[PDB]
Protein backbone atom coordinates (compact mmCIF):
# COMPACT_ATOMS: atom_id res chain seq x y z
CA UNK A 1 0.00 0.00 0.00
CA UNK A 2 0.89 3.73 -0.15
CA UNK A 3 2.59 3.65 -3.59
CA UNK A 4 6.37 3.46 -3.40
CA UNK A 5 9.47 3.38 -5.53
CA UNK A 6 10.05 -0.28 -6.41
CA UNK A 7 13.33 -2.01 -5.55
CA UNK A 8 14.10 -4.74 -8.14
CA UNK A 9 15.68 -7.62 -6.27
CA UNK A 10 18.19 -9.84 -8.01
CA UNK A 11 20.77 -10.23 -5.24
CA UNK A 12 19.06 -10.07 -1.80
CA UNK A 13 16.40 -12.33 -0.26
CA UNK A 14 14.71 -10.79 2.79
CA UNK A 15 13.01 -12.74 5.59
CA UNK A 16 9.64 -12.08 7.17
CA UNK A 17 9.99 -11.48 10.96
CA UNK A 18 13.78 -10.95 10.58
CA UNK A 19 15.96 -8.06 9.41
CA UNK A 20 17.97 -8.55 6.23
CA UNK A 21 20.53 -6.14 4.70
CA UNK A 22 19.59 -4.86 1.24
CA UNK A 23 22.46 -4.49 -1.24
CA UNK A 24 21.49 -2.15 -4.09
CA UNK A 25 24.31 -0.46 -5.95
CA UNK A 26 22.66 0.01 -9.33
CA UNK A 27 22.26 3.63 -10.34
CA UNK A 28 18.58 3.77 -11.31
CA UNK A 29 17.56 1.66 -8.29
CA UNK A 30 19.47 3.44 -5.51
CA UNK A 31 17.47 6.60 -6.25
CA UNK A 32 14.40 4.42 -5.74
CA UNK A 33 15.94 3.20 -2.46
CA UNK A 34 16.47 6.81 -1.31
CA UNK A 35 12.99 7.93 -2.42
CA UNK A 36 11.34 4.86 -0.82
CA UNK A 37 13.13 5.47 2.48
CA UNK A 38 11.85 9.02 2.09
CA UNK A 39 8.39 7.53 1.44
CA UNK A 40 7.79 7.15 5.22
CA UNK A 41 10.33 4.31 5.41
CA UNK A 42 8.46 1.85 3.19
CA UNK A 43 10.14 -0.24 0.48
CA UNK A 44 8.36 -2.31 -2.17
CA UNK A 45 10.28 -5.40 -3.29
CA UNK A 46 9.54 -7.33 -6.48
CA UNK A 47 12.17 -9.57 -8.04
CA UNK A 48 13.00 -10.00 -11.72
CA UNK A 49 14.83 -12.37 -14.01
CA UNK A 50 13.51 -11.05 -17.36
CA UNK A 51 16.65 -9.50 -18.64
CA UNK A 52 18.45 -7.72 -15.85
CA UNK A 53 18.16 -3.94 -16.13
CA UNK A 54 18.24 -1.15 -13.57
CA UNK A 55 14.79 -0.01 -14.75
CA UNK A 56 11.64 -0.75 -12.79
CA UNK A 57 9.99 -2.35 -15.80
CA UNK A 58 6.45 -3.78 -15.67
CA UNK A 59 7.57 -6.47 -18.13
CA UNK A 60 10.53 -7.62 -15.99
CA UNK A 61 8.76 -7.78 -12.62
CA UNK A 62 6.36 -10.62 -11.82
CA UNK A 63 2.86 -10.46 -10.37
CA UNK A 64 4.10 -11.58 -6.92
CA UNK A 65 5.68 -9.34 -4.30
CA UNK A 66 6.67 -8.75 -0.66
CA UNK A 67 6.64 -5.75 1.65
CA UNK A 68 9.58 -4.09 3.41
CA UNK A 69 9.21 -1.53 6.18
CA UNK A 70 12.61 -0.02 6.91
CA UNK A 71 14.34 -0.71 10.22
CA UNK A 72 17.53 1.32 9.59
CA UNK A 73 17.65 4.51 7.50
CA UNK A 74 21.09 4.46 5.89
CA UNK A 75 22.09 5.06 2.27
CA UNK A 76 25.60 5.17 0.79
CA UNK A 77 25.51 6.60 -2.75
CA UNK A 78 29.30 6.24 -3.08
CA UNK A 79 28.73 2.51 -3.70
CA UNK A 80 26.24 -0.17 -2.67
CA UNK A 81 23.50 1.26 -0.42
CA UNK A 82 23.73 -0.40 2.99
CA UNK A 83 20.18 -0.53 4.37
CA UNK A 84 18.57 -3.05 6.74
CA UNK A 85 14.82 -3.48 6.26
CA UNK A 86 12.34 -6.06 7.47
CA UNK A 87 9.23 -7.77 6.18
CA UNK A 88 6.40 -8.59 8.55
CA UNK A 89 3.69 -9.48 5.98
CA UNK A 90 4.19 -10.50 2.36
CA UNK A 91 2.19 -9.05 -0.51
CA UNK A 92 1.39 -9.33 -4.22
CA UNK A 93 1.53 -6.88 -7.12
CA UNK A 94 -1.47 -4.75 -8.08
CA UNK A 95 -0.18 -1.86 -10.21
CA UNK A 96 2.21 -1.28 -13.10
CA UNK A 97 3.44 2.13 -14.25
CA UNK A 98 6.45 2.29 -16.64
CA UNK A 99 9.35 3.58 -14.63
CA UNK A 100 11.36 5.23 -13.28
CA UNK A 101 9.45 5.33 -11.13
CA UNK A 102 7.08 2.37 -11.02
CA UNK A 103 4.26 3.19 -8.60
CA UNK A 104 2.62 0.13 -7.11
CA UNK A 105 0.63 -1.08 -4.14
CA UNK A 106 1.48 -4.07 -1.97
CA UNK A 107 -0.44 -4.96 1.16
CA UNK A 108 -0.71 -3.88 4.80
CA UNK A 109 2.16 -3.78 7.31
CA UNK A 110 1.27 -6.03 10.25
CA UNK A 111 2.12 -9.27 12.07
CA UNK A 112 0.65 -12.65 11.10
CA UNK A 113 0.25 -15.49 13.62
CA UNK A 114 -1.28 -18.92 12.93
CA UNK A 115 -4.82 -19.82 13.94
CA UNK A 116 -4.58 -23.59 13.59
CA UNK A 117 -1.44 -25.08 15.10
CA UNK A 118 -1.80 -28.90 15.04
CA UNK A 119 -1.44 -29.78 11.34
CA UNK A 120 0.63 -26.58 11.16
CA UNK A 121 3.26 -27.81 13.62
CA UNK A 122 3.06 -31.33 12.13
CA UNK A 123 4.10 -30.01 8.72
CA UNK A 124 6.57 -27.64 10.43
CA UNK A 125 8.18 -30.60 12.22
CA UNK A 126 8.28 -32.60 8.97
CA UNK A 127 9.92 -29.65 7.22
CA UNK A 128 12.43 -29.18 10.05
CA UNK A 129 13.33 -32.89 9.95
CA UNK A 130 13.66 -32.57 6.17
CA UNK A 131 16.02 -29.58 6.51
CA UNK A 132 18.01 -31.28 9.26
CA UNK A 133 18.58 -34.37 7.14
CA UNK A 134 19.21 -32.30 4.00
CA UNK A 135 21.70 -30.07 5.81
CA UNK A 136 23.61 -33.25 6.71
CA UNK A 137 24.09 -33.89 3.01
CA UNK A 138 24.69 -30.14 2.67
CA UNK A 139 27.77 -30.51 4.88
CA UNK A 140 29.93 -30.65 1.74
CA UNK A 141 28.08 -27.55 0.50
CA UNK A 142 28.37 -26.07 3.97
CA UNK A 143 25.73 -23.79 5.44
CA UNK A 144 25.29 -23.17 9.15
CA UNK A 145 22.17 -24.65 10.68
CA UNK A 146 22.09 -22.91 14.07
CA UNK A 147 20.12 -20.15 12.31
CA UNK A 148 17.05 -22.39 12.20
CA UNK A 149 17.59 -23.76 15.71
CA UNK A 150 17.42 -20.29 17.27
CA UNK A 151 14.07 -19.44 15.61
CA UNK A 152 12.19 -22.59 16.65
CA UNK A 153 9.80 -20.62 18.85
CA UNK A 154 8.27 -18.86 15.86
CA UNK A 155 5.45 -21.18 14.78
CA UNK A 156 4.47 -19.10 11.72
CA UNK A 157 4.64 -21.74 8.95
CA UNK A 158 4.96 -19.39 5.97
CA UNK A 159 7.76 -17.50 7.75
CA UNK A 160 9.61 -20.74 8.55
CA UNK A 161 9.11 -21.80 4.93
CA UNK A 162 10.66 -18.45 3.94
CA UNK A 163 13.55 -19.31 6.29
CA UNK A 164 14.25 -22.95 5.33
CA UNK A 165 13.42 -22.21 1.69
CA UNK A 166 16.10 -19.54 1.97
CA UNK A 167 18.49 -21.89 3.83
CA UNK A 168 18.60 -24.25 0.85
CA UNK A 169 20.01 -23.05 -2.46
CA UNK A 170 18.46 -24.83 -5.45
CA UNK A 171 17.57 -21.75 -7.57
CA UNK A 172 17.37 -18.10 -6.53
CA UNK A 173 14.41 -17.37 -8.85
CA UNK A 174 12.24 -20.13 -7.39
CA UNK A 175 13.23 -18.84 -3.94
CA UNK A 176 11.97 -15.45 -5.14
CA UNK A 177 8.75 -17.19 -6.15
CA UNK A 178 8.40 -18.83 -2.71
CA UNK A 179 9.43 -15.67 -0.83
CA UNK A 180 6.72 -13.70 -2.63
CA UNK A 181 3.96 -16.35 -2.51
CA UNK A 182 0.72 -15.66 -0.69
CA UNK A 183 -0.17 -19.31 -0.04
CA UNK A 184 1.68 -21.19 2.70
CA UNK A 185 0.73 -24.84 2.11
CA UNK A 186 1.77 -24.55 -1.54
CA UNK A 187 5.23 -23.26 -0.63
CA UNK A 188 5.51 -25.91 2.12
CA UNK A 189 4.79 -28.84 -0.21
CA UNK A 190 7.03 -27.16 -2.80
CA UNK A 191 9.97 -27.08 -0.34
CA UNK A 192 9.16 -30.71 0.53
CA UNK A 193 9.37 -31.74 -3.13
CA UNK A 194 12.58 -29.74 -3.52
CA UNK A 195 14.19 -31.50 -0.55
CA UNK A 196 12.87 -34.73 -2.10
CA UNK A 197 14.65 -34.21 -5.44
CA UNK A 198 17.71 -32.90 -3.59
CA UNK A 199 18.18 -35.89 -1.27
CA UNK A 200 17.28 -38.27 -4.11
CA UNK A 201 20.01 -36.81 -6.31
CA UNK A 202 22.37 -36.94 -3.30
CA UNK A 203 21.73 -40.66 -3.11
CA UNK A 204 22.17 -41.05 -6.88
CA UNK A 205 25.48 -39.23 -6.46
CA UNK A 206 26.48 -41.75 -3.78
CA UNK A 207 25.46 -44.59 -6.12
CA UNK A 208 27.59 -43.21 -8.97
CA UNK A 209 30.47 -42.57 -6.51
CA UNK A 210 30.52 -46.16 -5.29
CA UNK A 211 30.17 -47.24 -8.94
CA UNK A 212 33.31 -45.25 -9.75
CA UNK A 213 35.28 -46.64 -6.76
CA UNK A 214 34.36 -50.20 -7.72
CA UNK A 215 35.36 -49.56 -11.34
CA UNK A 216 38.67 -48.23 -9.99
Amino acid sequence: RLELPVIPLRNTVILPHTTTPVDVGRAKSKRAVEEAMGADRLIFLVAQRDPEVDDPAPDDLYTWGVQAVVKQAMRLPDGTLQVMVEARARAQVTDYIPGPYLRARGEVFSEIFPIDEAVVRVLVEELKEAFEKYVANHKSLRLDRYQLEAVKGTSDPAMLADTIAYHATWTVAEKQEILELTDLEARLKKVLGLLSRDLERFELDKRVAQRVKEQM
Binding site: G193, S196, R197, E200, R201, L204
Partner: protein
Protein backbone atom coordinates in the same frame (compact mmCIF):
# COMPACT_ATOMS: atom_id res chain seq x y z
CA UNK B 1 11.61 -34.78 -9.34
CA UNK B 2 13.43 -37.77 -10.88
CA UNK B 3 13.45 -36.09 -14.31
CA UNK B 4 14.78 -32.93 -12.64
CA UNK B 5 17.67 -35.06 -11.39
CA UNK B 6 18.14 -36.83 -14.75
CA UNK B 7 18.12 -33.69 -16.88
CA UNK B 8 20.27 -32.19 -14.11
CA UNK B 9 22.77 -34.91 -14.91
CA UNK B 10 22.35 -33.92 -18.56
CA UNK B 11 23.20 -30.37 -17.51
CA UNK B 12 26.22 -31.77 -15.69
CA UNK B 13 27.35 -33.58 -18.85
CA UNK B 14 26.86 -30.36 -20.80
CA UNK B 15 28.88 -28.50 -18.15
CA UNK B 16 31.68 -31.03 -18.42
CA UNK B 17 31.54 -31.42 -22.20
CA UNK B 18 31.95 -27.69 -22.68
CA UNK B 19 35.29 -28.12 -20.87
CA UNK B 20 36.91 -30.95 -22.86
CA UNK B 21 36.54 -32.52 -26.30
CA UNK B 22 36.23 -31.13 -29.79
CA UNK B 23 34.21 -28.12 -28.79
CA UNK B 24 33.73 -25.84 -31.80
CA UNK B 25 30.82 -28.07 -32.75
CA UNK B 26 30.09 -29.64 -29.40
CA UNK B 27 27.36 -27.18 -28.46
CA UNK B 28 26.14 -27.96 -31.97
CA UNK B 29 26.45 -31.61 -30.92
CA UNK B 30 24.29 -30.69 -27.91
CA UNK B 31 21.71 -29.13 -30.21
CA UNK B 32 21.64 -32.24 -32.41
CA UNK B 33 21.22 -34.30 -29.23
CA UNK B 34 18.39 -31.95 -28.43
CA UNK B 35 17.30 -32.35 -32.07
CA UNK B 36 16.97 -36.09 -31.49
CA UNK B 37 13.72 -35.46 -29.62
CA UNK B 38 12.94 -32.60 -32.02
CA UNK B 39 13.46 -34.30 -35.38
CA UNK B 40 10.53 -36.62 -35.63
CA UNK B 41 12.32 -39.94 -35.82
CA UNK B 42 11.43 -43.57 -35.03
CA UNK B 43 11.84 -45.26 -31.69
CA UNK B 44 14.42 -47.65 -33.06
CA UNK B 45 16.12 -44.44 -34.16
CA UNK B 46 15.39 -42.88 -30.77
CA UNK B 47 16.93 -45.98 -29.19
CA UNK B 48 20.08 -45.86 -31.31
CA UNK B 49 20.16 -42.21 -30.29
CA UNK B 50 20.09 -43.49 -26.73
CA UNK B 51 22.99 -45.72 -27.79
CA UNK B 52 25.07 -42.86 -29.14
CA UNK B 53 23.84 -40.83 -26.19
CA UNK B 54 25.60 -43.46 -24.11
CA UNK B 55 28.48 -43.06 -26.56
CA UNK B 56 28.43 -39.33 -25.82
CA UNK B 57 29.72 -37.62 -22.67
CA UNK B 58 33.15 -37.67 -24.24
CA UNK B 59 35.01 -36.76 -21.03
CA UNK B 60 38.27 -37.53 -22.85
CA UNK B 61 40.18 -36.08 -25.80
CA UNK B 62 38.95 -33.97 -28.70
CA UNK B 63 40.64 -36.72 -30.68
CA UNK B 64 38.02 -38.15 -33.07
CA UNK B 65 35.66 -39.67 -30.44
CA UNK B 66 33.72 -36.47 -29.73
CA UNK B 67 33.87 -35.46 -33.39
CA UNK B 68 32.62 -38.78 -34.72
CA UNK B 69 29.77 -38.61 -32.20
CA UNK B 70 28.93 -35.12 -33.48
CA UNK B 71 28.89 -36.47 -37.02
CA UNK B 72 26.68 -39.35 -35.96
CA UNK B 73 24.20 -36.88 -34.42
CA UNK B 74 24.45 -34.78 -37.59
CA UNK B 75 23.60 -37.70 -39.84
CA UNK B 76 20.83 -38.57 -37.37
CA UNK B 77 19.00 -35.30 -37.20
CA UNK B 78 19.73 -34.19 -40.75
CA UNK B 79 18.66 -37.18 -42.75
CA UNK B 80 14.96 -36.52 -42.23
CA UNK B 81 12.70 -39.02 -40.59
CA UNK B 82 8.95 -38.48 -40.25
CA UNK B 83 8.86 -35.46 -42.60
CA UNK B 84 7.30 -35.66 -46.03
CA UNK B 85 5.83 -33.85 -49.02
CA UNK B 86 2.07 -34.00 -49.54
CA UNK B 87 2.06 -35.90 -52.79
CA UNK B 88 -0.27 -35.42 -55.71
CA UNK B 89 -2.96 -38.02 -56.08
CA UNK B 90 -3.29 -37.50 -59.79
CA UNK B 91 -1.80 -38.46 -63.09
CA UNK B 92 -4.00 -35.82 -64.68
CA UNK B 93 -2.19 -33.12 -62.73
CA UNK B 94 1.08 -34.87 -63.54
CA UNK B 95 0.20 -34.64 -67.21
CA UNK B 96 -0.63 -30.98 -66.60
CA UNK B 97 2.89 -30.46 -65.31
CA UNK B 98 4.43 -32.43 -68.20
CA UNK B 99 2.63 -30.08 -70.54
CA UNK B 100 5.58 -27.76 -69.98
CA UNK B 101 8.85 -29.67 -69.88
CA UNK B 102 10.03 -30.14 -73.45
CA UNK B 103 6.43 -30.95 -74.52
CA UNK B 104 7.35 -34.49 -73.45
CA UNK B 105 7.30 -35.93 -77.01
CA UNK B 106 4.25 -38.21 -76.24
CA UNK B 107 6.39 -41.36 -76.18
CA UNK B 108 7.86 -41.91 -72.75
CA UNK B 109 5.68 -39.45 -70.93
CA UNK B 110 2.78 -41.80 -71.46
CA UNK B 111 4.92 -44.61 -70.05
CA UNK B 112 5.51 -42.56 -66.93
CA UNK B 113 1.80 -41.95 -66.94
CA UNK B 114 1.31 -45.74 -66.98
CA UNK B 115 3.67 -46.34 -64.13
CA UNK B 116 2.10 -43.64 -62.04
CA UNK B 117 -1.42 -44.62 -63.09
CA UNK B 118 -0.89 -47.93 -61.41
CA UNK B 119 0.73 -46.07 -58.56
CA UNK B 120 -2.04 -43.67 -58.03
CA UNK B 121 -3.98 -46.93 -57.81
CA UNK B 122 -1.99 -48.31 -54.88
CA UNK B 123 -3.98 -51.08 -53.24
CA UNK B 124 -3.35 -53.78 -50.72
CA UNK B 125 -4.27 -51.47 -47.77
CA UNK B 126 -0.75 -50.07 -48.06
CA UNK B 127 1.64 -48.85 -50.67
CA UNK B 128 3.20 -52.02 -52.07
CA UNK B 129 5.38 -51.78 -55.13
CA UNK B 130 6.54 -55.34 -56.01
CA UNK B 131 7.74 -53.40 -59.02
CA UNK B 132 10.81 -51.77 -60.57
CA UNK B 133 11.76 -48.12 -60.36
CA UNK B 134 11.57 -47.78 -64.19
CA UNK B 135 15.22 -47.00 -64.97
CA UNK B 136 16.13 -44.75 -67.89
CA UNK B 137 18.83 -44.86 -70.56
CA UNK B 138 20.03 -42.51 -73.29
CA UNK B 139 22.76 -40.01 -74.15
CA UNK B 140 23.49 -37.70 -71.20
CA UNK B 141 22.47 -34.27 -72.46
CA UNK B 142 18.81 -35.10 -73.04
CA UNK B 143 16.29 -34.26 -70.44
CA UNK B 144 17.18 -36.66 -67.66
CA UNK B 145 17.24 -34.11 -64.89
CA UNK B 146 14.55 -32.17 -66.74
CA UNK B 147 11.99 -34.99 -66.92
CA UNK B 148 12.67 -35.94 -63.34
CA UNK B 149 12.43 -32.25 -62.52
CA UNK B 150 8.96 -32.00 -64.00
CA UNK B 151 7.85 -35.15 -62.20
CA UNK B 152 9.08 -33.76 -58.90
CA UNK B 153 7.02 -30.69 -59.76
CA UNK B 154 4.02 -32.91 -60.44
CA UNK B 155 4.07 -34.69 -57.12
CA UNK B 156 5.09 -31.38 -55.53
CA UNK B 157 8.19 -33.11 -54.32
CA UNK B 158 11.83 -32.30 -54.82
CA UNK B 159 14.38 -33.60 -57.27
CA UNK B 160 17.98 -34.41 -56.51
CA UNK B 161 20.98 -35.99 -58.16
CA UNK B 162 23.66 -38.22 -56.73
CA UNK B 163 26.11 -39.77 -59.16
CA UNK B 164 27.65 -43.21 -59.71
CA UNK B 165 30.10 -42.80 -62.57
CA UNK B 166 33.38 -44.46 -61.71
CA UNK B 167 32.27 -46.03 -58.42
CA UNK B 168 33.58 -49.53 -57.74
CA UNK B 169 33.15 -50.30 -54.05
CA UNK B 170 30.42 -51.09 -51.63
CA UNK B 171 32.84 -49.06 -49.50
CA UNK B 172 31.79 -46.29 -51.88
CA UNK B 173 28.16 -47.35 -51.52
CA UNK B 174 28.08 -48.06 -47.82
CA UNK B 175 30.30 -46.13 -45.50
CA UNK B 176 32.58 -47.58 -42.83
CA UNK B 177 33.02 -47.98 -39.10
CA UNK B 178 32.49 -44.75 -37.18
CA UNK B 179 35.51 -45.37 -34.95
CA UNK B 180 37.60 -42.55 -36.38
CA UNK B 181 36.75 -39.22 -37.91
CA UNK B 182 36.78 -39.33 -41.66
CA UNK B 183 34.24 -42.12 -41.35
CA UNK B 184 31.10 -41.03 -43.14
CA UNK B 185 28.29 -42.91 -44.84
CA UNK B 186 28.31 -43.46 -48.55
CA UNK B 187 26.60 -41.18 -51.01
CA UNK B 188 22.97 -42.08 -50.55
CA UNK B 189 22.56 -41.05 -46.95
CA UNK B 190 23.93 -37.65 -47.87
CA UNK B 191 21.58 -37.40 -50.84
CA UNK B 192 18.72 -37.98 -48.41
CA UNK B 193 20.42 -35.53 -46.04
CA UNK B 194 20.05 -32.92 -48.77
CA UNK B 195 16.26 -33.11 -48.85
CA UNK B 196 13.99 -32.66 -45.83
CA UNK B 197 11.37 -35.28 -46.73
CA UNK B 198 10.95 -39.02 -46.37
CA UNK B 199 9.25 -38.97 -49.77
CA UNK B 200 11.83 -37.48 -52.14
CA UNK B 201 13.08 -38.57 -55.52
CA UNK B 202 16.70 -39.64 -56.10
CA UNK B 203 18.25 -39.61 -59.57
CA UNK B 204 20.99 -42.22 -59.85
CA UNK B 205 23.49 -41.22 -62.47
CA UNK B 206 25.48 -43.24 -64.99
CA UNK B 207 25.14 -46.44 -63.01
CA UNK B 208 26.23 -48.69 -65.88
CA UNK B 209 29.62 -46.96 -65.51
CA UNK B 210 29.91 -48.07 -61.91
CA UNK B 211 32.52 -50.72 -62.64
CA UNK B 212 33.57 -52.78 -59.64
CA UNK B 213 37.31 -53.56 -59.63
CA UNK B 214 38.16 -53.92 -55.91
CA UNK B 215 36.67 -55.73 -52.89
CA UNK B 216 32.91 -55.75 -52.42
CA UNK B 217 30.25 -55.43 -55.02
CA UNK B 218 28.42 -52.14 -55.24
CA UNK B 219 25.88 -53.97 -57.46
CA UNK B 220 25.02 -56.13 -54.46
CA UNK B 221 24.05 -53.21 -52.22
CA UNK B 222 22.35 -51.54 -55.16
CA UNK B 223 20.17 -54.54 -55.96
CA UNK B 224 19.41 -54.53 -52.24
CA UNK B 225 18.29 -50.91 -52.55
CA UNK B 226 16.35 -51.66 -55.75
CA UNK B 227 14.33 -54.40 -54.02
CA UNK B 228 11.08 -52.75 -52.81
CA UNK B 229 11.30 -54.09 -49.24
CA UNK B 230 15.02 -54.63 -48.81
CA UNK B 231 15.42 -50.91 -49.17
CA UNK B 232 13.07 -50.70 -46.21
CA UNK B 233 15.64 -52.89 -44.44
CA UNK B 234 18.66 -51.22 -46.05
CA UNK B 235 21.48 -49.80 -43.95
CA UNK B 236 25.14 -48.95 -44.52
CA UNK B 237 28.29 -49.56 -42.55
CA UNK B 238 27.97 -46.27 -40.68
CA UNK B 239 24.52 -46.65 -39.23
CA UNK B 240 22.50 -48.83 -36.86
CA UNK B 241 18.78 -48.85 -37.69
CA UNK B 242 17.97 -49.14 -41.42
CA UNK B 243 16.35 -46.04 -42.87
CA UNK B 244 12.86 -46.71 -44.14
CA UNK B 245 13.60 -46.47 -47.83
CA UNK B 246 10.21 -47.84 -48.87
CA UNK B 247 8.54 -44.43 -48.54
CA UNK B 248 11.12 -43.02 -50.97
CA UNK B 249 10.48 -43.00 -54.69
CA UNK B 250 13.43 -43.69 -57.01
CA UNK B 251 14.48 -43.18 -60.65
CA UNK B 252 17.74 -43.94 -62.43
CA UNK B 253 19.85 -42.67 -65.33
CA UNK B 254 22.34 -44.78 -67.25
CA UNK B 255 23.58 -44.93 -70.85
CA UNK B 256 24.33 -48.55 -71.73
CA UNK B 257 21.79 -51.35 -71.85
CA UNK B 258 24.55 -53.97 -71.73
CA UNK B 259 27.21 -53.05 -69.14
CA UNK B 260 24.54 -52.94 -66.44
CA UNK B 261 25.32 -55.50 -63.71
CA UNK B 262 23.27 -58.64 -63.82
CA UNK B 263 20.92 -58.86 -60.74
CA UNK B 264 20.11 -55.25 -61.59
CA UNK B 265 18.73 -56.65 -64.86
CA UNK B 266 15.83 -57.77 -62.72
CA UNK B 267 13.79 -55.35 -60.56
CA UNK B 268 14.20 -52.99 -63.51
CA UNK B 269 12.18 -51.52 -66.32
CA UNK B 270 14.01 -49.90 -69.16
CA UNK B 271 12.65 -46.87 -70.96
CA UNK B 272 15.16 -45.89 -73.60
CA UNK B 273 15.54 -42.12 -73.53
CA UNK B 274 15.38 -40.55 -76.99
CA UNK B 275 17.95 -38.60 -79.03
CA UNK B 276 15.66 -35.65 -79.85
CA UNK B 277 14.64 -34.21 -83.21
CA UNK B 278 15.90 -30.84 -84.38
CA UNK B 279 12.50 -29.25 -84.38
CA UNK B 280 11.72 -29.94 -80.75
CA UNK B 281 15.23 -28.95 -79.63
CA UNK B 282 14.84 -25.80 -81.68
CA UNK B 283 11.53 -25.13 -79.96
CA UNK B 284 13.31 -25.41 -76.62
CA UNK B 285 16.03 -22.97 -77.68
CA UNK B 286 13.27 -20.66 -78.82
CA UNK B 287 10.99 -20.87 -75.81
CA UNK B 288 12.90 -21.79 -72.71
Amino acid sequence: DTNQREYYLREQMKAIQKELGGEDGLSDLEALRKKIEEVGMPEAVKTKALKELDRLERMQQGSPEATVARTYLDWLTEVPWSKADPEVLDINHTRQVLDEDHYGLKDVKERILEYLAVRQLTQGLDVRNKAPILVLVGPPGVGKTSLGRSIARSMNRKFHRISLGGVRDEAEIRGHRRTYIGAMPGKLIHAMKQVGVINPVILLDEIDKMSSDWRGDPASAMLEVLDPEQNNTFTDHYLDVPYDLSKVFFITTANTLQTIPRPLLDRMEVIEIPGYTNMEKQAIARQY
